[model samples]
Target: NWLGGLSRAAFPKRFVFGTVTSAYQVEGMAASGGRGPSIWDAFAHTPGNVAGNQNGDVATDQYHRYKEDVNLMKSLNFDAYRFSISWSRIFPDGEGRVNQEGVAYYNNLINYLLQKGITPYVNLYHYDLPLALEKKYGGWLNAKMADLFTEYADFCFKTFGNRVKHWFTFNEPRIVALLGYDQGTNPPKRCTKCAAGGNSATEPYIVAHNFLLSHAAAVARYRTKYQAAQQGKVGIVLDFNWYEALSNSTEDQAAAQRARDFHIGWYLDPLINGHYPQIMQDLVKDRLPKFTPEQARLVKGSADYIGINQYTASYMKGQQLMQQTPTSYSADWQVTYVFAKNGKPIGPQANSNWLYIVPWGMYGCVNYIKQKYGNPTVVITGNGMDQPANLSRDQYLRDTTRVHFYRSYLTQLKKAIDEGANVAGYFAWSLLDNFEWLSGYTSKFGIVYVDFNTLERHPKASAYWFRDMLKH
Candidate 1:
């Protein structure tokens, strides 16, 4: 049932087919090439942050081996590569003089991708804020971060905008605020009463407010100063998990709608509607900050498009009645995310605890965005599955499950386009197995497996499947 009836030819000829990666996840030499430590470097260093307490010091060693990785991408028949820049690499102390070494390194990588005829979709800021910025002025939570981020973005545009045409301002900014500020799960682990110290009840909202301003300002910078010359599009990446209401009941339906609002609408609402959703304003209330008139206009149409990193689906119900605990963003949603309803699971589980395989959810998510948000340009920037890292090499290489995941998801994606979803491109989650945050190296999410010790690339069965599927 996989790829038998599906073909790239079914989509528009201009549809982009590619794979995705980030500097911190794929590029090793985390602090090499005069690169400094990012908050991730600090996050993974603590006694019990990331799984295995492992850091990205040598993740896939792509810093030294990007040429090899690019070769693999070409061999797999991908037309483009969506990768993020390491802000810490370019601005070690978070600002001031440029690190020519870091600039030269990215130049080489981008040049080689062009040398191999692979289009590059460059993303800036993918959860790896420079440690210096976080230490100096409370990253993302501080308003001045908008200025700092725009400065960094403006520099990147002047230096690399000539070559990179598709630019994303930030990848999953909500997660940056939610996980780091509310849950204390990611870098700069700060939350209410946590070891690092933050007000989860309010800090997450403040952090998100800071992120929206930063994102909008950077988009404004690029549009006003660079886009005319660069001739490129700018967008933001958001991670959206589809939510299926537990049943047809009103409560279940509202709960599912609220979950969707909390996920993508949290960011897109301010970007599209120039204000937070009514439900959010009603629930989050004064805790949710309001945008000034000037800031509202800036964020109103900041994005030329949206990039959604979709994966799985879950069931939702109105928040289970419980003792009124401390009010954080988590409780602010007033919804419960469940994997099943009445003992029937939404889908099979993947290696990651949170990812349940529900292929049809892709259709739900993309179409929902299309109908709810005025049918703006959209890109399926990241969608893939993972396997256990402990699997044998040959077993991992024969990733039939991964193949099925892609085919089914793409099948649903094609259906979305059939119904006028305005999707322009599709990028698989990753091209190489590398260090996953928190889970460390335990969850393999790459089409190509990396021999960590030897630093070699072995194309998995799914990679072969994509090669054949794209050939049409």
Candidate 2:
């Protein structure tokens, strides 16, 4: 291991470190656990949606074997387990009726984690809204969707809050709004010209608006009903790729800022302040959603902390301002992105197209949040690296590359905290190789290697590296 003298002792004792995983990405038994179909299921099942025409129907069988997974975490010396509660699992129809079996499975998992002396960090949603909701009320596009989402949130808080203290409202609402609505890449895949039709220019803003509103409502309910007695803090997870200007020129700097505003500022501005970012307000104009005075009050101070999932960085330059009859959110930024500055690449690219290995981006991401949002308590919720599946099992298990990814990235995180970022915790992207979203099982981000056929998990070399680094 090249992690010479780098260990958990480099940080304060209060700082938390753990491995993170999500439901759709890991837990199999999608049809069981009293779970109803989610939008992901529909999207993955549809012809031409997912790679190899794969779905998460039986992903690692975690639903039936969470005890084994928790045992893995325990053995790996992880302190917390960040998992998400499925909306359909709670209310199979998406709202109203409760799914007792679903409740029992999570109760078992949470109680087991507590028994194992593991803190449970539960998130409300992770890109798996019930298909029922999408078809019935057009999902997050509806203005009243906030109330529906809160009902689900209210249930999770009441059911799991007693044992689970760390709660995140949504895992990257921007992905749903942007990719699902604007880009037509993910589920509920809709855009101006997408087969699943949507007004790309306007619908994305609407979805984003409800995400903020629903998030506010979810936090509002938690603070109102369960917080005092349960003593839990609620936050939202936002994913941002650090944008580095290609050069010191004014155009490049402005372009970088526009990318940041279009990405992180899309959701962060609404939570930290009452309205959209000035750039968004200036660009989106009437198409951008507005909040009422009462809504503003509800949203402004909603989050107790922020969960930042920063994976990569991009070099940004200005795109030529072009006039079009109909513009979309993707085009609104008018920025061009590349992974390199001149002939020098930003960093070695990862298995995922979006991931570029730039350790300094973590420091920049944390510091940017500190300066812009007044440095609220933050958690590095998702980090680590991925590899393609073309490698042999022996080669995949010897994950020296992933070990490098973690060591370099954590050094940056440690530096950020040393400079006072109020960062309380960090969670690795995953615990085991599970189903990647659109990439299916083609990309592996987990430290633990899973034999998809036999459903057996074996810890890769990086897992031992973490085991060594985390040793006090």
Candidate 3:
């Protein structure tokens, strides 16, 4: 066994181990549960968006088989299940009267999770913004959307807070802004010169500004209206990829620091330090939005815990100032990303182009957060590796590569925790192979393989590996 003597008991007592799934990625019945169309539904329906032109219309039929999935988690010895609640399901038009059917579905799910002794870690948003709001307002682009988001978040807490103790306001808001507006890769696609037409230079910053407002407002709502009574925790999830300087040279070293500042620091600075990172202020100058004193106060201490989705790492080198003139949010970083240095790859490649199997990156990522962000309580909200979906069921179910990925990554995570990072928990990216957003079903990140046609799940070797390692 790759795990050696590492087991559930090796980590700190009360350290949480779980699996995570977003609603759109796994839940089917997309249109049947009074669930209004999300931007993803609209985007996937259009041609040339998702791979194989596939949509999540019946993604693993998890809407009908959550019980079976819950059993899969319990049988695997997971302490919790981190899942997202679809906003459109709860507020079909994004506001106004509640969708009773949507509320019942989640209530039943939450009740069953409790009955099965699985703690539910619920996230309110997972990039599935309701299409109605996207058309009515400019989605996350408008400041008004922040208040609208808080209303939806408030509804979730008021209804589900009693049963759901852990809540995240949004999952990787940075991805939403960067990919949706700057690059126009995901839903509500908009970028300079794209058919959808957006100002890449400014829209991403505007979107992120709204994210802070929306996240802070929801957190504030939860603390004032529900926390004293319900005793729940609220936070936001950010995606972090450790950046190593291509060389020890001062320029490359500073380039890597600039990358970190632009990436996580863009959000964490205001969220923790009450201002934009100094590097961002210098580069993004005037383009980056400012927080009012009141806004800063709310944003500064909003999170009870910070959740980071650690996946991979990259080597970075400084770029010239006249680097083609900043045209987008990404260009402002002024760094070149290097996957390898001296002809040696940073790590093994996962099926996903963006995912490199760098175990030490997990240690670097956690420790960086610790030193930079006051080591606030953290949860490794999502972590895993994916293989191409075209692999045969037998080939996929073996999942030896995935087993090794987890073994190495978790070892680094353990090292970080042992060294005084205040990490509270860890959750695998997913439980079942479902519809990956832009990749559609082309990539499988799950510990269990799902037959899309039969909607039957076959637990992979990694599932059993986790079962054994987590066995009490």
**Highest lDDT scorer:** 3
- The model with the greatest TM-score is 3
RMSD of each: 1.5, 1.2, 1.0
Please provide, for model 2 over 1-472, each residue's C-alpha lDDT reduced to its tens digit, 9 standing for 90 to 100: 3786578788877778888888888887789868999999998988878878889999888898899999988888888889888888889889888999999999999999999989999888999999999999989889788999998998888888888899999999888888999988998889988988988899989999999999999898988899999998999999988998888988889999999999999988889987789988988888998899999889998988999998999999875556655578988888998887769899998898788999999998999999998998899899988989778788889988898889899989888889988999999988989889898999999999988878898999999888888775
Per-residue lDDT over 94-138 for candidate 1, one digit per residue giving the tens place of the 0 to 100 score: 899789999999999999999999999999999999999998998
Candidate 1 segments exceeding 4 Å error? 319-326
Error of 2 at 453 (Å): 0.9
lDDT of 1 at 345: 87
Q: Rank the candidates by lDDT, best first.
A: 3, 1, 2
Per-residue error at 247 for model 3, in Å?
Answer: 0.8
Worst 10 residues of 3 by lDDT: 318-327
Positional deviation of 266 in candidate 1, in angstroms?
0.7
The better-scoring model by lDDT among 2 and 3 is 3
lDDT of 3 at 356: 95
Per-candidate local distance difference test: 0.89, 0.89, 0.91
lDDT (tens digit, per residue) of candidate 3 on 39-152: 999998888889999998899888889899999899999999999999999989888868899999999999999999999999999999999999999799999987898889
